Design a protein around this ligand. Structure first.
Ligand SMILES: [Cu+2]
Length: 128
């Protein structure tokens, strides 16, 4: 089983994957996020945030006004299944979550909540 994925967010507003597969035999799944660019996090910060497709817009909106010092996420927001911190150029963060948190018939999305990023920085996550 492959129970981790490495993801990059760059200075051109791109994640390097659009779709993440979580092998259902994994008890835990890990995302290792890094930022290959030169731009600092107040200009081009990225996080990796997971929610159901239905919840994505609310999480993104709640985040846009939570501000930079809250990593553009509403604190202790239970719609967020898992998230990293907001990182800038040359930084990295990882998150590990319980695969039991994923419902098998549900649609999940991952995205960055830095204001405006999620138009491009989004993809699917699928338990299979
Ligand atoms: Cu971003």
């Amino acid at each position: 089983a492959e129970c981790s994925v490495d993801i990059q967010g760059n200075d051109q507003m791109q994640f390097n994957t659009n779709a993440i597969t979580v092998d259902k035999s994994c008890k835990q799944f890990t995302v290792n996020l890094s930022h290959p660019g030169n731009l600092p996090k107040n200009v081009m910060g990225h996080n990796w945030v997971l929610s159901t497709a239905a919840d994505m817009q609310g999480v993104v909106t709640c985040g846009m006004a939570s501000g930079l010092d809250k990593d553009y996420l509403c604190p202790d927001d239970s719609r967020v299944i898992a998230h990293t911190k907001l990182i800038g150029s040359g930084e990295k963060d990882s998150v590990t979550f319980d695969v039991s948190k994923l419902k098998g018939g549900e649609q999940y999305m991952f995205f960055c909540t830095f204001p405006g990023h999620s138009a491009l920085m989004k993809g699917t996550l699928t338990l299979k």
